Amino acid sequence: LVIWINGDKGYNGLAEVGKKFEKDTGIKVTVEHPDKLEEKFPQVAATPDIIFWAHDRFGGYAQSGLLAEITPAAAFQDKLYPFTWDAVRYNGKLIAYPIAVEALSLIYNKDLLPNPPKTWEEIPALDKELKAKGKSALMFNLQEPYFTWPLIAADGGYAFKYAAGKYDIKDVGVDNAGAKAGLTFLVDLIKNKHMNADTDYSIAEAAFNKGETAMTINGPWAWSNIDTSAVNYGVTVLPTFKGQPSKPFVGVLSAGINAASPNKELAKEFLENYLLTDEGLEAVNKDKPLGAVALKSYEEELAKDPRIAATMENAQKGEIMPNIPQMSAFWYAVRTAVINAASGRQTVDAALAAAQTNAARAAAMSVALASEYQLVQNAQLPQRWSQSARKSLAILEATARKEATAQMEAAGGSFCGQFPVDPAFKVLSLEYSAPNPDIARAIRRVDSVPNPPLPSHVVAIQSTAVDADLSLAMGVSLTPGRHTSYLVDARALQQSNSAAVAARKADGDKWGPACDEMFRGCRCVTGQEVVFYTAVKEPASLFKPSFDGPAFRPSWGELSGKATGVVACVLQVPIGKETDIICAEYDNLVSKGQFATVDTVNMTGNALIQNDGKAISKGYAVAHRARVTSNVYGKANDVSLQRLAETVWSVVEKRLSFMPAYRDLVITEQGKPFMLGATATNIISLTENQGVMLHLDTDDGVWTIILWFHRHSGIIAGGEFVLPSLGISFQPLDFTIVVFAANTIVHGTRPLQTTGKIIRWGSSHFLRFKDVNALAQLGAAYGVDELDAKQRDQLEEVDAANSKDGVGAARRVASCMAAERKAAIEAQKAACVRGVVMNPCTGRMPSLLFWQVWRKPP
Ligand SMILES: [Fe+3]
């Protein structure tokens, strides 16, 4: 049993609970507190056995089938308050165990305020009295609607209408009279000087803990801090409004079991019998406060503390937070409404009118986007496969193999350019000659060892008929008679990915002994053109093929009941006109200073570096400046970048016809202007004789392109590109390109040592989706073509400020532009503007595309 829980909880106490579990049963409990837990669970669970989080996010996990249905006996359900069970019900089924209950309360300073107001209506009078002594009645975080909603909801008003175990995303309750009344009262307190419309979390928490305000509104997480102050304080029921209870949202900390866990009946034993007990929860409570708990017996003990009783009281008068993803539409719309109404930028009536309409609209769009993503993940390539076609293609491929074999006889061997290719050997070092100003040419194998065999989960395809089947179905067309296709068992690929990551961690995040051991089992494919397909078995996983898709009849029976997908392809580009163009643009952009140094690696392309406050258009800072300062042609670098991306993309697409289909599928109309030309590339890297640790990428597109070329002569040892879960590695020769699914295939580059002046230039062409989303969003807010003018303006205003009042005054102006840009992006992001299609579950692109289902019934 592996359990993840947040770092601000009592995990060591929960680890003690796990220790009492390993004594009675011979089962160890290991408790991690991973960072970024909110988002890291839905990313990894899609591909711990127990997860500890607020119930509201578990509805989303349930929609994605990341949780097990919990089946407690009605005798165990009686140990817990019934509302806490509603917290953990998605679509009629129980999806987690309730642990703790949490809601806002009224917190008051006893010395300033022995009898706290029962009602909101007596607060302005009470602020009068307090104002005499230079103190305020009430100060709380007005910036986040989680805090102001209790008041707004009191007289009616709700997020989404609950009915028949479901939230109706179309029925928003922001706009009614009850809500208007509540918000009107809130802004009235501001317009009568009682509350300051600027007050946030920190301001309110400072003021109360120093004795400047009599009351604050906060939750149990805040008690610790007050405990360190000179304040004598209580915690009580929230004030009523028009005689109704303030209605705060209730968050129920819950424990859900992973749907992909083999450990279901022994996590059920652990949580029902070792944590949900008085000694179980107290163990955890000693480590860290829980506030109110769901377990009736222990709650009765904690309720002896008035603060805890007050929490449960406010919780029972409140509303349980909807466990659906569309709460984000609700929150953003209401946050804007409250900020506007409180600043006088809108009438209360106008603010809630717009919030209602916007939330409804955004909630609808998010559902539309979820259904569209499914069609993206399930989309098929234009059909070229047929039994006649694959037979025809196999003949053609078979003819090409005889030709290549005759060429190989006539020439005395196999060659990639001038480099001798012999798969009996593994190329550990190699020599390049630079006889002219063109690219240095790979000429001679220097060091070698016998070439390791393929690992057992990777098979070379021998049959031309099978070659044809995959080629047609997968949009791959490698050099006829001069390539090798491989099939990789999908389960073993995922296991080997984890082993590779483990090795890199054990080596201390570098190429060390564990990575080297793996490398020694990697077979060399230097000088080869190859493709790897992974085959997913029908469940009857890291990869998500739809087994409801159309099926083809394979000539190979072993493919039946499986789906294939392209995970990697190595091309050897013949030195010529395209390599001239590509290499020239690198040289142009290097000379003209258009590569920015980053976290090392140089980058160029259509970035949006938000850390640069004054950035408001596509490209790195040097690119913004070159458009303005040039005295010949302002778009020159943009022309050079587009030719660079398009020439690489063209060379790749000749061989891999799925690539344009992937481009057309994932780039939205709003994203197209921010790609480099008609490609799926928006960022291009450049490295000089550099290795990189084994890793998966996370926030890139489905496939990434990597290329290399060489400048002077000399010898390179090491520097192989390694794909350890595919069991292969290679030295880049004249112009090697790899196209691969970098979010799902571990990959890295070993350190190099050189003799002579030789430079190996490496370059990744990839889709960094955050930049294209932010830019698509800026395009929506300002107009695509207006960005250049805005960039030109913002550069002048900042230079003027720097030229007039110094660096600090300039960075103040940048800071101003950043906040304005941030506001514009946020509003478009909330209106669901996107540059790319993304998994709403993961916030990432799909793990692969264009799965083909094979079935051979008899
Ligand atoms: Fe990478």
Author numbering: -366 to -320, -316 to 176, 185 to 243, 250 to 508
Verbatim from the authors:
After various trails, an N-terminal MBP-fused CMD1 with an α-helical linker yielded crystals of high diffraction quality, which led to the successful structure determination of CMD1 in apo form. The structure of the MBP-fused CMD1 in apo form was solved by the single-wavelength anomalous dispersion (SAD) method at 2.20 Å resolution with the asymmetric unit containing one MBP–CMD1. In the strutcture, most residues of the catalytic domain of CMD1 and the MBP are defined with unambiguous electron density except for a few surface exposed regions (residues 177–184 and 244–249 of CMD1, and residues 1–7 and 55–57 of MBP); however, the C-terminal region of CMD1 (residues 509–532) is completely disordered. There is a metal ion bound at the active site, which is interpreted as Fe2+ owing to the presence of Fe2+ in the protein solution and a reasonable B-factor for the Fe2+ in the refinement. The MBP was fused to the N-terminus of CMD1 via an α-helical linker to facilitate crystal packing, which results in the formation of a long α-helix comprising the last α-helix of MBP, the α-helical linker, and the α1 helix of CMD1. In the apo CMD1 structure, the MBP is located in adjacent to CMD1, and its position and orientation are dictated by the long α-helix. There are only a few interactions between one short α-helix (residues 44–57) from the N-domain of MBP and two surface loops of CMD1 (the β8–β9 and α12–β23 loops). As the MBP is located distantly from the active site of CMD1, it has no direct impact on the chemical property and structure of the active site. Among the conditions examined, CMD1 displays the highest activity in the HEPES buffer at pH 7.0 which was used in the enzymatic activity assay; however, it is inactive in the citrate buffers at pH 5.0–6.0, which were used in the crystallization solutions for both the apo CMD1 and the CMD1–DNA complex.
Very lately, a TET homologue in a green alga Chlamydomonas reinhardtii, named as CMD1, was found to exhibit a novel enzymatic activity. However, unlike the canonical TET proteins, CMD1 uses vitamin C (VC, l-ascorbic acid) rather than 2-OG as co-substrate, which surprisingly contributes the glyceryl moiety (the C4–C6 atoms) to the C5-methyl group of 5mC with glyoxylate and CO2 as co-products. Structural analysis shows that CMD1 assumes a typical DSBH fold. The Fe2+ at the active site is coordinated by the three conserved residues of the HXD…H motif.
